[PDB]
Design a binder for these strands. Structure first.
Ligand SMILES: Nc1nc2c(ncn2[C@@H]2O[C@H](COP(=O)(O)OP(=O)(O)OP(=O)(O)O)[C@@H](O)[C@H]2O)c(=O)[nH]1
Ligand SMILES: [K+]
Ligand SMILES: [K+]
Ligand SMILES: [K+]
Ligand SMILES: [Mg+2]
Ligand SMILES: [Mg+2]
Ligand SMILES: [Mg+2]
Ligand SMILES: [Mg+2]
Ligand SMILES: [Mg+2]
Ligand SMILES: [Mg+2]
Ligand SMILES: [Mg+2]
Ligand SMILES: [Mg+2]
Ligand SMILES: [Mg+2]
Ligand SMILES: [Mg+2]
Ligand SMILES: [Mg+2]
Ligand SMILES: [Mg+2]
Ligand SMILES: [Mg+2]
Ligand SMILES: [Mg+2]
Ligand SMILES: [Mg+2]
Ligand SMILES: [Mg+2]
Ligand SMILES: [Mg+2]
Ligand SMILES: [Mg+2]
Ligand SMILES: [Mg+2]
Ligand SMILES: [Mg+2]
Ligand SMILES: [Mg+2]
Ligand SMILES: [Mg+2]
Ligand SMILES: [Mg+2]
Ligand SMILES: [Mg+2]
Ligand SMILES: [Mg+2]
Ligand SMILES: [Mg+2]
Ligand SMILES: [Mg+2]
Ligand SMILES: [Mg+2]
Ligand SMILES: [Mg+2]
Ligand SMILES: [Mg+2]
Ligand SMILES: [Mg+2]
Ligand SMILES: [Mg+2]
Ligand SMILES: [Mg+2]
Ligand SMILES: [Mg+2]
Lengths: 129, 386, 63, 130
RNA sequence: GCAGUCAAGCGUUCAUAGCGACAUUGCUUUUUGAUUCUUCGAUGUCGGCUCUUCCUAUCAUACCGAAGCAGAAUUCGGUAAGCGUUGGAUUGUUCACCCACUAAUAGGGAACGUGAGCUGGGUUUAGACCGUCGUGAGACAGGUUAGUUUUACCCUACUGAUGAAUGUUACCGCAAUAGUAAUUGAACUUAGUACGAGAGGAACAGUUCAUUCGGAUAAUUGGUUUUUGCGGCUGUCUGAUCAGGCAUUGCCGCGAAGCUACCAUCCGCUGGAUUAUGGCUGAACGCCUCUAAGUCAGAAUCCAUGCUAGAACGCGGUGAUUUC
RNA sequence: CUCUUAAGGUAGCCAAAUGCCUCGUCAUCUAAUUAGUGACGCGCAUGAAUGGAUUAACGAGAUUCCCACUGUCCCUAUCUA
RNA sequence: GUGAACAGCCUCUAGUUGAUAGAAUAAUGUAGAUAAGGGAAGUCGGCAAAAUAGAUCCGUAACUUCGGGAUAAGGAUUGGC
RNA sequence: UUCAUCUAGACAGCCGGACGGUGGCCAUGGAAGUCGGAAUCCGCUAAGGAGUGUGUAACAACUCACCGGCCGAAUGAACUA
């Protein structure tokens, strides 16, 4: 589904909320598919599905856990074609466990692998990378 | 009481002891299983690690999300001048293991290989093999009988070959002598192959081919005495730790009342013999073939030597084997490449690479230009020259 | 493959070399080295930095 | 989901030849026909909309799988058509499935059709009024 | 705490798929009791962190047997400790509870492993406050606050490193022995197929990745700056300039080399014998029977292939071996 | 309505550095809180110069949260004396 | 001299050049630092470290014993000629 | 060790029959040997239970006790240590 991407969003990272669902940021609390290792923080990368809370945003989006999908990383990562790239900020979009977005639009670009992995994020995205 | 949190062991106990290798040349502890129907051919080769670079090639991997498009891959380049056959060793099977019955050397040995048999070459009298060379006085009657014993016996036949290291930019000047097993049927023909090849050179084209998976056997880069944190990857102790934190906190329970072999402890790191398997050759380039670093898609007249030369090695002027990834050992170090011990069929092997571009920019910095022609074409006229 | 152009200094970028930066406005900036990347992040002017091809073109250097 | 939950009407236009209009045991005039086609749901949980569909229609296209034969719902849905006095026409579907999966060589396919029609005709025979 | 025997019954019928009362036989020493045998010229007293090993009463993974096993899921059990068994909120805590990921978040020992390994949050000196008790000094498995964690250079153990002797020296080898390593998941396809009324929903083979671990390596990217390499800046000094000194590396930007990062890249092998188990022939016991003789396949098992070290008192081959 | 005292805790305040049960109950704070705060009070065993309550300012006093900040950590690496 | 300044830094008079030294630059230390992405997820506990910092101008809350809080918070500028 | 079958044919093996009154009485929505209480009978009999199980909504249909056909000499059961 996806090649390994340098993890830049450990548990506790707060990224920008990229959709128009009314949230201003996402606070990562877990990562789907993350491994187990003593003392090792679960960390997210481009295109990864995480569990997140809303720290700033519309009041009914706050105080509850919801799936999110990382659309911008801002941590340098290496493609197979040798390109080390990163975005200006960390950004994700609120989505259901099935990967369908809660919002209806994307602000900013979206990673290639994220668009490949999630068609709904790709469909709601504008320009990619 | 129990550890209270399970975690995998730090380090691999099968690579013990973590001591210095007894020689700068790693020993080939296993050769490919002999198939008595194939022709006689070397199962290994001797080269020297020159350095690393990058290439571009189309990825041929059906079922991959990224099939049929371009990948950038690191590759290690090993200078592999042809090895000179100077001897033949026979091994007979015994209930105590393999035993060398006898060894038959070539008539004339170059000073390069003779230097291996002396620690002080400058003040020596170079008497080595002078009485042995007399064994070829009229017909080599002792020699042909010695070879006949190898044919009558010695179920395993190995050739004694040495590197042509004066052809490398190394200041070593002393060749590395090694035994390479001759695979192929008709042991008598093995001795015939070796005897015919005395004083003769064997090129890397006869051992390796494009896309082949080979084994890298070399002594890793030495790092001296090392603490437990980097030697084994053990967790760093907190900043609050008294008497230092780059240590292992508990080196053992009260009972057994001894430090156990499985506990990470400080000592020498690196300079170990490693045998890393399944490295794919991407090039078998020829030293005399100008434009070594060119591909069917570039055609630019440039050798494999990077602009300014391989860092810490020099310029490559001989046959070189480019393997994918990295191999044990540092630059300038003797390495031996051997055949794979099994037939690997997993679509990573059998995958036929065709290079699109080879990086020839300077490794001495953030290299911007592949060739001196490109540097002039970019910057134009300078004040010093050009 | 296809050789790109450093967005700050104009140097040719070969496959695997340098870094890529996507701004919030989705603009792409390719840097051939950490020097050009750091100068861009420092917000120096390519017209004003004396070794960039854009500076040389503005000052009629080389031509 | 992959299922049918409703009964939606669709209108179809069908031109034919003169030679088969002669092969009609019904008073007709012309060469063109108009079809009002309903796609009933197969599930028993939606077995009321098929009753609505049957009342609004006069013919029934009974699609039967050659693999599974006559199922419980084919039993049920055809029964209600016969209760409404709907004339069914039966089509045997998934013959491609039997020809790549079951590898029926020469006669097994004919016998499956034979058994299918016999089982279908049993249903219409016992639930048809005179 | 764990495991058995009998089976009145539960389980729609049906003691034993799964359970199982009244009874009864045991095992274990991570519970806590009982005792006071060792230690009071002193074994450093909780918990956490770190790290190794071991046990199996096995949570997951491997292969299986049974089901009230249609599929999926699940339950009981067997061979099995090879390999994993987490990140956090609160609390010194062990324990507990919740959030969440995960294939799983199994239980334990090793002087209730581990303080000349750390820490000192707690307990458990001396200071201090409160509540209760006491006339009082003071007492509190009552609460709260502050409160010095000393020494290895000795022997052994372990990690590494030399080294006399076997005629000398040099090169190329063998491998007894010791260790050993890989682990797991996801996606596509099979296939919306087997099965099932339907809902649902596999599995073998194949492909691409990923998790944890391991070993290397620096082509690229990032870090590192005493390259004090270049440039800039401040204060001062060398009359000014140029060039520089000092500011404990004066500071700032870039910075090659080396080192180094799942923050970077590459690689991590396949044959046999077996366990459970399923079977073949075939008696015992004219039948039957995987078992008694014999025998087939078969597990993350074991042994090998492979990788590491090379017995410094294991060995082989080979070259030269002091004109004085 | 009783038993009973010298008087039977008044104004206030509280799971408070004082509450065992207790990690009390409700609310808020968090994804999750034996922590914090606001409430309630038959309060083992709160309470009025053995001072009660509240207090601006002050505090190398104890505690909780937020922004910023960072190698405390993920996950360690490098350099200098 | 810089500088608000007996602050820190450099220099003039004066004084000293006195601490056992030489060679390399392993581990682990002591002291000084840096570190991509994240930002307390470490830990009993933000311990330690980092971040802020001078001067000019704008602006400055709750509360208050009206005296303060207050440099609140939050901002903009600074060289040379 | 004890008790049983046994050339008038034991056990095992394979094959045949396993009836009629009668769907015994009563209950049951249905109960016909086989969800239940009770009755545990007669006739034909070499022999068949008011039934050994499977099974049906209830029938049915197989199956078993029971008796025979083939072979011809031993066999079975319950206990003891
Ligand atoms: N191989 C094969 N598959 C078929 C054939 N006909 C139908 N199918 C399968 O049957 C499924 C159901 O058919 P659809 O027509 O899509 O829908 P439907 O039959 O109305 O099912 P419902 O809507 O639930 O009633 C399809 O997804 C097909 O995959 C056939 O002829 N051959
Ligand atoms: K004592
Ligand atoms: K570097
Ligand atoms: K100066
Ligand atoms: Mg931890
Ligand atoms: Mg454990
Ligand atoms: Mg300390
Ligand atoms: Mg370089
Ligand atoms: Mg760099
Ligand atoms: Mg339909
Ligand atoms: Mg002592
Ligand atoms: Mg002791
Ligand atoms: Mg067991
Ligand atoms: Mg202890
Ligand atoms: Mg100790
Ligand atoms: Mg101690
Ligand atoms: Mg304390
Ligand atoms: Mg008192
Ligand atoms: Mg490493
Ligand atoms: Mg001076
Ligand atoms: Mg059989
Ligand atoms: Mg047997
Ligand atoms: Mg030896
Ligand atoms: Mg009161
Ligand atoms: Mg109270
Ligand atoms: Mg309170
Ligand atoms: Mg907290
Ligand atoms: Mg009081
Ligand atoms: Mg002044
Ligand atoms: Mg950082
Ligand atoms: Mg940063
Ligand atoms: Mg932040
Ligand atoms: Mg914490
Ligand atoms: Mg913690
Ligand atoms: Mg501090
Ligand atoms: Mg201010
Ligand atoms: Mg204030
Ligand atoms: Mg019945």
């Amino acid at each position: 589904t996806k090649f390994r991407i340098s993890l830049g969003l450990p548990v506790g990272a707060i990224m920008n909320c990229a959709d128009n669902s009314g949230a201003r940021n996402l606070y990562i609390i877990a990562v789907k598919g993350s491994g187990s290792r003593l003392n090792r923080l679960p960390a997210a990368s481009l295109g990864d599905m995480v569990m997140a809370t809303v720290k700033k945003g519309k009041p009914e989006l706050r105080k509850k856990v919801m799936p999110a999908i990382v659309v911008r990383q801002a941590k340098s990562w290496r493609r197979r074609d040798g390109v080390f790239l990163y975005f200006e900020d960390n950004a994700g979009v609120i989505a259901n466990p099935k990967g369908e977005m809660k919002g209806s639009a994307i602000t900013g670009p979206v990673g290639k692998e994220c668009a490949d992995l999630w068609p709904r994020v790709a469909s709601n995205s504008g320009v990619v990378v | 009481s129990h550890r209270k949190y399970e975690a995998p062991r730090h380090g691999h106990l099968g690579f013990l002891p973590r001591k210095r290798a007894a020689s700068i040349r790693a020993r080939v502890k296993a050769f490919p299983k002999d198939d008595r129907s194939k022709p006689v051919a070397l199962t290994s080769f001797l080269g020297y690690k020159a350095g690393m670079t990058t290439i571009v090639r189309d990825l041929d991997r059906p079922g991959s999300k990224f099939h049929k498009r371009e990948v950038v891959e690191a590759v290690t380049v090993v200078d592999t001048p042809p090895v000179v056959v100077v001897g033949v060793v026979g091994y007979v099977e015994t209930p105590r293991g393999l035993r060398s019955l006898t060894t038959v050397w070539a008539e004339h040995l170059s000073d390069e290989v003779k230097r291996r048999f002396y620690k002080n070459w400058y003040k020596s009298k170079k008497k080595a093999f002078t009485k042995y060379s007399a064994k070829y006085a009229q017909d080599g009657a002792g020699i042909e009988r010695e070879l006949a014993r190898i044919k009558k016996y010695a179920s395993v036949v190995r050739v004694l070959v040495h590197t042509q290291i004066r052809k490398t930019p190394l200041a070593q000047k002393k060749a590395h002598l090694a035994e390479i097993q001759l695979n192929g049927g008709s042991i008598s023909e093995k001795v015939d192959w070796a005897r015919e090849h005395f004083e003769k050179t064997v090129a890397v084209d006869s051992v390796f081919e494009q896309n082949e998976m080979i084994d890298a056997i070399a002594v890793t880069k030495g790092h001296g005495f090392e603490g437990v944190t980097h030697r084994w990857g053990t967790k760093k102790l907190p900043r609050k730790t008294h008497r230092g934190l780059r240590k292992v906190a508990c080196i053992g329970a009260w009972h057994p009342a001894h430090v156990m072999w499985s506990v990470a402890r400080a000592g020498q790191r690196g300079y170990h013999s490693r045998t890393s398997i399944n490295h794919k050759i991407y090039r078998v380039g020829k030293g005399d073939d100008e434009a070594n670093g060119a591909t069917s898609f570039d055609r630019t007249k440039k050798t494999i030597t990077p602009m300014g030369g391989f860092v810490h090695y020099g310029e490559i002027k001989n046959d070189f084997i480019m393997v994918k990834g990295c191999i044990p050992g540092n630059r300038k170090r003797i390495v031996t490449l051997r055949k794979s011990l099994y037939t690997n069929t997993s679509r990573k092997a059998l995958e036929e690479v065709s290079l699109k571009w080879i990086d020839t920019a300077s490794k001495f910095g953030k290299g911007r230009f592949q060739t001196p022609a490109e540097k002039h074409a970019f910057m134009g006229t300078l004040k010093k020259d050009l | 493959m296809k050789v790109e152009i450093d967005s700050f200094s104009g140097a040719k970028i070969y496959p695997g070399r340098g870094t890529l930066f996507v701004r919030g406005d989705s603009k792409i900036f390719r840097f051939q080295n950490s020097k050009s990347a750091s100068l861009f992040k420092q917000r120096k002017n390519p017209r004003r930095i004396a070794w960039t091809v854009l500076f040389r073109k503005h000052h009629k250097k080389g031509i | 989901r992959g299922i049918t939950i409703k009964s939606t009407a669709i209108s179809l236009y069908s031109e034919m030849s003169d030679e088969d209009v002669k092969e009609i045991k019904q008073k007709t005039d012309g060469n063109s026909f108009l079809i009002n086609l309903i796609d009933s749901p197969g599930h028993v949980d939606f077995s009321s909309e098929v009753t609505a569909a049957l009342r609004v229609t006069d013919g029934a296209l009974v699609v039967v799988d050659t693999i599974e034969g006559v199922c419980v719902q084919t039993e049920t849905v055809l029964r209600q058509a016969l209760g409404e006095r709907i004339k069914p026409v039966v089509v045997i579907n998934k013959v491609d499935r039997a020809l790549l999966e079951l590898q029926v060589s020469k006669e097994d396919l004919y016998q499956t059709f034979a058994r299918t029609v016999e089982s279908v005709n049993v249903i219409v025979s016992t639930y048809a009024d005179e």
